[PDB]
Amino acid sequence: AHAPGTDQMFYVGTMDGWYLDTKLNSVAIGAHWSCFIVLTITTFYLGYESWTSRGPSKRTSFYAGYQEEQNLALFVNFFAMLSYFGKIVADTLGHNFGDVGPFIIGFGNYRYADYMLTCPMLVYDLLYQLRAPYRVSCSAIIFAILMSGVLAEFYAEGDPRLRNGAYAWYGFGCFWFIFAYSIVMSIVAKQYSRLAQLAQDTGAEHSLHVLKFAVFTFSMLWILFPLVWAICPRGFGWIDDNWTEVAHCVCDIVAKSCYGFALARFRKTYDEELFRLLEQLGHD
Amino acid sequence: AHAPGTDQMFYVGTMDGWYLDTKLNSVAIGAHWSCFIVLTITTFYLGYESWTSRGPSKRTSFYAGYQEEQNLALFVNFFAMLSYFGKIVADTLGHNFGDVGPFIIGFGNYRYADYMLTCPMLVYDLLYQLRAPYRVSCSAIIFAILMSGVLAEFYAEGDPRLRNGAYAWYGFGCFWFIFAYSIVMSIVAKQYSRLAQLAQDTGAEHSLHVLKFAVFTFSMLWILFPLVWAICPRGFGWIDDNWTEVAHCVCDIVAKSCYGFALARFRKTYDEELFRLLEQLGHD
Amino acid sequence: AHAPGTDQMFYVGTMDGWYLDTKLNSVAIGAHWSCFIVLTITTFYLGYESWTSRGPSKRTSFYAGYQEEQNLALFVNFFAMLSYFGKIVADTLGHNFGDVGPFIIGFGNYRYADYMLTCPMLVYDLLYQLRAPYRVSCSAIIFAILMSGVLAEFYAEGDPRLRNGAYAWYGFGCFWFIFAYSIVMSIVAKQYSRLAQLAQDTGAEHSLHVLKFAVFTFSMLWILFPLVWAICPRGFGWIDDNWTEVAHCVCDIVAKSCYGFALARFRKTYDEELFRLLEQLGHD
Ligand SMILES: CCCCCCCC/C=C/CCCCCCCC(=O)OC[C@H](COP(=O)(O)OCCN)OC(=O)CCCCCCC/C=C/CCCCCCCC
Ligand SMILES: CCCCCCCC/C=C/CCCCCCCC(=O)OC[C@H](COP(=O)(O)OCCN)OC(=O)CCCCCCC/C=C/CCCCCCCC
Ligand SMILES: CCCCCCCC/C=C/CCCCCCCC(=O)OC[C@H](COP(=O)(O)OCCN)OC(=O)CCCCCCC/C=C/CCCCCCCC
Ligand SMILES: *C/C=C(C)/C=C/C=C(C)/C=C/C1=C(C)CCCC1(C)C
Ligand SMILES: *C/C=C(C)/C=C/C=C(C)/C=C/C1=C(C)CCCC1(C)C
Ligand SMILES: *C/C=C(C)/C=C/C=C(C)/C=C/C1=C(C)CCCC1(C)C
């Protein structure tokens, strides 16, 4: 695209950049391959869990087929796998894939466009395990934060005259992220405190450790993405574009595959009394 | 973009127009600033209402955290605020923002693309307060009407050879809007008649006035947008592009901030018997 | 759009191709007109059914207004009608409409972008009539399959250097479609077997034939779209672009209008005992 006063052309948001050669090296391609393999393995594992999912009473046959929120995490990983498959295809074809081509929500050709579909599901899935309030609200504010990140990505890669819009959108997203982070931390802490005080001398002591570790760790590790934005060339630039892909791949692996495996480990050890305590949680 | 037979270039739907200088004057920028400030204030007020929201019985602590439909209106305003923040950013950067750049649903860089996310929520939120039937259907038809408006906006700003497509899409949207308008008016009138005949000699006479005023006024004031389309340069052209932004800002302010404040005023005066009458409404 | 090493320009995903003259003949325009007329007639018929919809007991007045899943099929046809109206407009204006212009989900300017909104609703609506499990999962995997088809359409129409990406995306979609097809066939067969063994000596023998024919026929006829992709120029090329539009129009007519008419025929002959058997289906 052309801009007034400059002879340089900008390929962000155009199909002209879609036909350009790739700018990545072997490290980024290897990171994409590793992330795709991990996501595929986790997707198959969660699908096998969903197929052979007896309930907490181990009596219902297709428990996940009727209570489909249990499949929610699986959905995330599945879509994540899709968002990486195209990257692999681009890496095999050798054409440019970063912030170029059509804008589709749920596809990873833009930096935070793929996260729009999966992150609200991640937040709702995490808040459900404690029967926490304000679940759809957190999902909506996370969707807004990701949209702000996408607009910042658009502003950063275009005309240098409009570079300051990226900082404004980043500040907007960071303000609302700090708000949502504080709300989520408070709600999760309160719900876990009530669950711990409801399960005294019950026998669910072993099954509480996995749930606590999962919810606290994978709710605290959501601050890595703003830090990656800060240290990548969008911010200070302490790392280059090739190591930003590796950081993003590691972040997705930790945030999705490990979280799904932790939920799968928790689901095979809890039973009826912990389930009824969880039901009692979301009523007072 | 290039068109056959003409040397002129069209910037609608391209990133070339994103880098162009802004075409607005001080009046439109002031209108955008006023709308953004009003939406931000209303969003904070509704968020404070949602945090400190005791139920109709004034016993449940996080009532809005579990019955999250009460937060629905808040969501609208929040997203509306986002749709104006970018406008402010453009006004601060001085680049063109109208019908240019990427097409994202929920962002206001296109005329009716931001309304796609929030208007169905507005319609469902308004129909819920009377426990009215046909709620998702009205939301879907409003989404279709907004999509028709977006296509008309695409056709109007492009090649003059294709100008008549805007009129066709406007006629499609107006036909379905007249249908939906009649259906909504009939349903709301019937539901309010039943509510009025259910609350004889109950004491909810004062609390009924606010609900009646809110639902009737903010369901009747939805016809302003087609009239603005008719009088703007898309239609007869009695006003210019700079005064169309002011009209749109006033329309959003009235349709969203006043409606949210009216719901907040209604929610703090109704109590258990009006709530159980509302519950009885949506059963026969 | 420009590509390195070639002087040829590619109009896929650009507004430059939106202003080009149409490439269709009278056959494709007639097919579009016929499909639009059929979809409009079916939409009006289903809307009249929804308005005058007494329940299975023939006592509830606005049964479809409160149980709105019954309107789901109607929604599909309505949106399908929208996706064809624009085509008609293009055919009346004479400008190019295939894989050009803005990318909007739910609009038919791209080959499988309109199906994204309606196909998951079709799958959920079909699985609900048997109270089958795994309804949202099938809808999500169908959405992913349609996204893969859209990416294949993008790769096929662009630079010949990137032609092999279309085959990769087609293989991805076909793999997941075979998986989903097998799952849906197994679930539907099991649910219908249980329904048949629950209705012995009941009198619902006549009302079972319509439901069986509808579900089996319109779940089996979903394999036509991959075959059309195989035989069109995207694959072997046994037919041209003008006869691909006719095949797609016939496929939409059969998959949507006939299915909606079959559901309308089934709904006016079943009564309370079949409804309670259907309720008992989705519990064990
Ligand atoms: C502006 C964006 C804001 C986004 C806010 C929301 C973010 C995403 C929220 C995800 C919501 C959860 C999706 C899945 C819900 C599934 C609920 C469910 O199946 O529970 C079971 C429940 C009841 O059980 P029965 O079937 O009766 O079984 C009884 C016999 N044992 O089943 C149902 O009734 C299902 C009815 C449909 C529920 C609504 C599903 C809507 C899904 C929308 C898409 C979800 C992802 C959206 C992502 C948004 C990205 C922009
Ligand atoms: C093609 C587009 C058509 C659009 C049609 C729909 C337009 C938007 C409709 C908005 C639907 C309402 C969204 C919010 C629903 C929230 C429901 C809810 O929370 O009610 C509470 C309810 C039950 O209460 P419990 O949590 O058990 O508490 C018991 C202890 N007291 O909670 C739930 O079960 C929530 C389950 C998830 C509900 C589904 C939410 C899906 C939201 C989808 C996005 C909504 C906006 C979509 C905009 C569309 C723009 C294209
Ligand atoms: C990533 C994409 C994955 C897509 C996965 C989902 C695909 C689409 C699934 C469609 C879900 C069904 C949509 C319609 C649900 C309507 C449910 C309903 O109305 O049931 C009635 C039910 C209960 O009855 P009452 O009103 O109490 O009446 C009592 C007095 N008799 O009413 C409700 O509570 C409605 C609450 C809202 C339900 C949630 C609706 C959300 C709709 C989201 C959009 C649906 C299409 C999405 C298409 C996706 C394309 C990307
Ligand atoms: C699987 C992916 C996950 C959990 C992604 C989470 C992403 C975020 C929390 C992103 C946050 C952002 C901001 C707070 C500011 C603006 C830019 C973002 C998108 C990096
Ligand atoms: C907060 C915004 C609201 C309530 C917007 C409402 C908008 C409409 C009712 C728009 C209607 C249109 C038509 C009926 C015809 C075609 C164009 C539109 C988009 C102006
Ligand atoms: C009303 C429209 C319907 C029911 C459409 C159904 C479409 C499909 C089942 C499409 C499937 C595809 C594949 C399996 C592979 C890749 C390309 C598609 C989109 C043709």
Strand content of chain A: under 5%
- Summarize the helix and strand pattern of chain A as letters: HHHHHHHHHH
Helix content of chain A: 55-70%
Please state the oligomeric state of the protein chains shown. homotrimer
* Ligands: 1,2-dioleoyl-sn-glycero-3-phosphoethanolamine, retinal
Largest interface: A-B, 34 and 33 residues
Could you state the CATH homologous superfamily of chain A? Rhodopsin 7-helix transmembrane proteins
Give the structural class of chain A. mainly alpha
Give the end-to-end Cα distance of chain A, rounded to a whole number of Å: 57 Å
**What is the gyration radius of chain A calculated from CA atoms?**
21 Å
Output the CATH topology of chain A. Rhopdopsin 7-helix transmembrane proteins
Count the beta strands of chain A: 0
Q: Give the name of the CATH architecture of chain A.
A: Up-down Bundle
Number of helices of chain A: 10
CATH class of chain A: Mainly Alpha
The shape of chain A, in one word, is: elongated
> Could you describe the largest sheet of chain A, including whether it forms a barrel?
none
Task: Give the helix/strand layout.
Three copies of one chain form a homotrimer.
Chain A: H1 26-51, H2 63-66, H3 72-93, H4 115-128, H5 135-156, H6 164-198, H7 205-220, H8 224-231, H9 241-267, H10 272-281
Brief synopsis:
Chain A has helices spanning 26-51, 63-66, 72-93, 115-128, 135-156, 164-198, 205-220, 224-231, 241-267, 272-281. With 284 residues, chain A is mainly alpha-helical.
Q: Could you characterize the architecture of this molecule?
A:
Three copies of one chain form a homotrimer. By secondary structure, chain A is mostly helical. The first copy, chain A, has a single domain, classed as Rhodopsin 7-helix transmembrane proteins (Rhopdopsin 7-helix transmembrane proteins). The first copy, chain A, is 65% helix and 0% strand. In chain A, helix 3 runs antiparallel to helix 9, helix 6 packs antiparallel against helix 7 and helix 7 runs antiparallel to helix 9. The radius of gyration of chain A is 21 Å and the shape is elongated. Chain A starts with 25 loop residues before the first helix and ends with a helix. Chains in contact: A-B, A-C, B-C. At the A-B interface, helix 5 and helix 6 of A face helix 2 and helix 3 of B. The structure holds 1,2-dioleoyl-sn-glycero-3-phosphoethanolamine (3 copies) and retinal (3 copies). The site of one retinal has 21 residues of chain B, from helix 4, helix 5, helix 6, helix 8 and helix 9. It is classed as membrane protein. Keywords: Channelrhodopsin, ion channel, membrane protein. It forms a trimeric assembly.
